[PDB]
Write a protein that binds this ligand. Structure first.
Ligand SMILES: Nc1nc(-c2ccccc2)nc2[nH]nc(Nc3ccc(C(F)(F)F)cc3)c12
Lengths: 252, 40, 172, 273, 57, 252, 40
């Protein structure tokens, strides 16, 4: 019986195996793919790193405890320091990616709680100072360390998850590709996202595509014992990496 | 009748299209069926 | 500064110099060195620019002289280049001086945005153009001279312009 | 004709359409007939009224400028005297329109403009005059007018329109975006730098529209307000998103107040009707 | 539709389109594909906007 | 008239144009190519960086003056710090390359002199100390800076070009793919070299393939004037780069 | 539809034409070919 709860993902030279998972999501119903001749405008033979880049990378885990506000990662920024992908990002003048985003969170039958995992394109952030203040580059491109909504700042973006980070309400964030992790049912969530942009290819350093939000909706509790602490781990891979134009390594 | 040969000048012509909510309501790899377990 | 006259169209090359920069500029079709060229003048009547540019250089020194030059294009997002080691990582051609006196470098369209502005605009910067001494300028024994190149620009067949506007070349 | 519901009688099956898992992120297309007994009935509706084209393709005020007709004063810049006025093109100035466009991430359309002028004479006037108003496009790289009547206004290459106060201008402008669609949001910067503007403003190089009274001074000061309306046509949009709940502060920016009012009406008890 | 560029791979030939002489007064119609590797792509442009008629009319 | 003296090489996004050149050499009569299924033994989908790596790189030039002994570069070592190629070299457990090697040296009709350009596979070097002494890693992997045979050392390899660097005589080095640069005739030399090894693929860090020797046979002179100084520039590109196995960046 | 029988009154009608840059880019008696020596 090929239960829908059990999946294996093989990508490049890495695999993910799950036993308690919900059906994976293909954002907007479109599987990731390469740029067509019709869409293309950049007159350069492209580079396709293939399986040297299109493999799973794992980001440092974070602890989910009572009082946690949630976390935010930017793509492709989060992977800028990882593997050949991270290096290619600074040599190629432009490129395009799709992603497989996998969020993990283990628990027992005695635990309760719920994470909301959402992928938001072009998630332009509000500044902590409001007014005419823009969020500085340094605070929108943290790499592997995501934006911890639990941390105080005055120069960073606003951190209150009710309003996401842009003035919309979290209740309506479900319009975006999303999946929930209920500790009682599933320990993983998987979202596959095609390249989404107004242009064929774009900078991979001055602009983010996708903003991965992981926001707890229901705090972690347990039937008994002290406040629980459950790690949350995020694993991300490029799908159809396609790059163009060679330059000296970009300096940020 | 169009009176201008610059297409932007055209009035807001168009047809109604069948809706396709599946892009926003059922973006899943494995097809779910009504009445079937969601969690197999 | 201090180049009044036709000297502005002459790029000097000197003996015994190696790895040094011959010239470089920021690639604008608006207010850069290309401002007064025909592409400049035509582009100043349009808002949107797209497509490939062609640069060409012609050597005017002694028939007995020789040199190899590196001509390079540095895509958007990069800085400088300040060293040949950086320039060589972009799109480039190595030009051997000989019977055929002219080199043509077609600068490919590398933008991730379908159109770029003719006016300077950070978001659509076209990057940089530079030239370095691949080897050095060599003149006949016991001679010492400065030789020059003439730079040219034209559009590639794949060149697009949109949305007409008035220029800033008129002052009354 | 499309049916709204079909006759359905009591069931006692192992098939359970009322029971699912939102965990999957999917919303299954269930019907009333999957819960209760139903009767066959038609929709008598095509949904044409809710098409994207109708939602966005209605005129809306975008911007209002004030220009005056007065004897020029030599001690002040003509722009400061309001002898002419420059409107940087955007659709984000007035929230009633912005809010709708904000509901999509990428939007593509042609534009239709309507420009309406009204005069006023809040002074000891002897008579009224119907002024002629000029509106001119000034795309990036084009010269910006400095004096109320310098050479710039010749409009040799710049699209422009003349109309009288009490009358209106109308014209179409084709999609002018560089990309395949206009971005409503931009999670990025103009370039790789620590200090640079963030957000959609960096993509807004639409240029400006200049307004002028083309008449000479006429003894008294006449104030003209010019209202610009915009309507989108042939509209496409991609990637829908949640609407903004909090008040807007500035153009382009998504900033909000330091201590925003929670835009959810409250009640005494979870069971209060 | 008119192509902007056609796929072209690395060359090692005696034919040298990148080397010429402006002395002749001619500008040869060379392309990016004569310098670097390229990928097939369309122009999606007719050039109608740049006709003499629009420039002056 | 398509004269054999004039050539253009286009590779990746870079070109070389020459007007005074000898026919290029294809070492051993075999053009570089990809690993076949028949030859392959490594069970991993390979990576083919294509034109992101297979482009020309230029190494720092060196001055050729009277008294110069010649220079030596190792491949792939020389390119270890250049572009994406250099980065890929430390992430991939094994790989294979072919090369296009181009050596340039300008002069006028009033100059005399002759360089011998030779590509030697597996050029195992003799140590300066002789006896049982091995040459240390640090002195066989100098990167862009080649081994200048004009420089003194006591820990490096022997530097006397008569015996190459291994006890054979230079006179017989012409058995290897080679080309001469006579300043009176040609200013360039070009050699194309296929992957040559006993194994399908190999480490690109613990082992060199090819050793590029540039040794002056006839000193640079001139009909008149002081001792001349002519720069020598070397430009090298991978041909059919093929890589396999992903690991954390190797640390040397 | 033209409403006036005096041809100057006609609107700015016309077709787009294929470009012919050879008049300005290759005005040479002896045809030059890409890849061939310019100086034979
Ligand atoms: N100017 C823009 N450019 C881009 C963009 C540029 C490059 C790549 C991608 C997107 N996105 C935009 N989104 N909103 C923009 N502002 C806007 C657009 C139209 C109009 C009006 F009214 F003219 F239609 C007025 C203001 C805008």
């Amino acid at each position: 019986g090929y239960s829908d709860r059990v999946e294996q993902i093989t990508l490049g030279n890495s695999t993910i195996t799950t036993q308690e998972a919900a059906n994976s999501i293909v954002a907007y119903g479109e599987w990731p793919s390469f740029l067509s001749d019709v869409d293309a405008s950049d007159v350069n033979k492209t580079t396709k790193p293939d399986t040297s880049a299109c493999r799973f990378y794992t980001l440092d885990s974070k602890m989910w405890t009572q009082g946690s506000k949630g976390w935010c990662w930017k793509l492709p920024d989060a992977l800028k320091d990882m593997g050949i992908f991270g290096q290619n990002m600074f040599f190629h003048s432009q490129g395009r990616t799709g992603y497989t985003i996998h969020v993990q969170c283990n628990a027992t039958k005695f635990h309760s709680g719920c994470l909301l995992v959402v992928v938001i394109p072009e998630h332009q952030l509000a500044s902590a100072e409001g007014g005419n203040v823009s969020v500085l580059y340094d605070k929108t491109h943290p790499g592997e360390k995501g934006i911890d909504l639990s941390e105080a700042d005055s120069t960073g973006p606003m951190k209150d998850p009710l309003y996401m980070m842009d003035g919309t309400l979290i209740g309506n964030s479900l319009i975006f590709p999303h999946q929930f992790i209920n500790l009682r049912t599933n320990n993983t969530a998987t979202i596959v996202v095609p390249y989404i942009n107004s242009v064929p290819m774009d900078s991979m350093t001055r602009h983010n595509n996708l903003s991965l939000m992981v926001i707890p909706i229901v705090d972690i509790t347990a039937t008994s014992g002290t406040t629980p602490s459950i790690p949350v781990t995020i694993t991300i891979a490029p799908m159809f990496l396609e790059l163009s134009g060679i330059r000296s390594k970009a300096v940020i | 009748i169009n009176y201008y040969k610059d297409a932007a000048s055209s009035s807001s012509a168009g047809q109604s299209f069948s809706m396709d909510p599946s892009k926003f309501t059922e973006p899943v790899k494995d097809i779910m069926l009504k009445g079937a377990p969601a969690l197999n | 500064t201090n180049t009044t006259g036709l000297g502005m169209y002459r790029i000097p090359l000197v003996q015994n110099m190696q790895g040094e920069q011959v010239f470089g500029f920021r690639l604008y079709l608006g207010d850069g060195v290309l401002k007064t060229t025909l592409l400049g003048e035509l582009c100043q009547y349009f808002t949107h620019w797209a497509g490939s540019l062609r640069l060409s250089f012609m050597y005017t020194g002694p028939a007995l002289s020789s040199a190899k030059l590196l001509i390079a294009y540095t895509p958007p997002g990069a800085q400088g280049p300040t060293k040949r080691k950086e320039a060589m990582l972009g799109t480039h051609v190595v030009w051997d001086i000989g019977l055929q006196s002219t080199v043509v470098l077609n600068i490919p369209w590398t933008s991730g945005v379908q159109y770029r502005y003719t006016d300077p605009d950070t978001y659509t910067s076209a990057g940089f153009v530079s030239c370095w001494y691949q080897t050095s300028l060599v003149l006949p024994p016991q001679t010492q001279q400065t030789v020059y190149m003439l730079g040219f620009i034209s559009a590639c067949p794949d060149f697009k312009l949109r949305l007409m506007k008035d220029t800033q070349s008129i002052h009354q | 004709q499309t049916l709204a519901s079909i006759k359905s009688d009591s069931k006692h099956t192992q098939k359970v359409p009322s029971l699912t898992a939102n965990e999957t992120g999917a919303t299954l297309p269930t019907t009333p007939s999957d819960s209760v007994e139903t009767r066959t009935t038609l929709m008598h509706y095509t949904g044409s009224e809710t098409t994207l084209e109708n939602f966005l393709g209605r005129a809306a005020c975008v911007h209002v400028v004030e220009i005056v007709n007065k004897r020029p004063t030599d001690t002040e810049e003509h722009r400061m005297q309001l002898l002419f006025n420059n409107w940087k093109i955007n659709l984000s100035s007035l929230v009633q329109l912005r809010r709708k466009l904000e509901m999509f991430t990428y939007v593509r359309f042609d534009s239709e403009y309507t420009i309406i002028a009204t005069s006023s004479q809040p002074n000891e006037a002897k008579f009224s005059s119907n002024l002629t108003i000029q509106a001119m496009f000034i795309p990036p790289g084009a010269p910006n007018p400095k004096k109320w009547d310098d050479y710039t206004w010749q409009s040799a290459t710049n699209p422009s329109v003349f109309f009288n106060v009490g009358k209106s201008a109308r014209f179409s402008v084709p999609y002018l975006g560089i990309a395949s669609a206009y971005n409503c949001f931009y999670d990025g910067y103009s370039h790789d730098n620590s200090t640079t503007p963030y957000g959609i403003n960096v993509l807004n190089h639409m240029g400006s529209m200049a307004f002028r009274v083309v008449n000479e001074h006429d003894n008294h000061t006449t104030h003209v307000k010019v209202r610009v309306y915009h309507r989108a046509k042939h509209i496409r949009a991609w990637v829908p998103r949640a609407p903004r709940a909090l008040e807007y502060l500035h153009i382009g920016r998504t900033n909000y107040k330091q201590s925003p009012q929670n835009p959810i009406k409250t009640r005494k008890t979870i069971s209060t009707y």
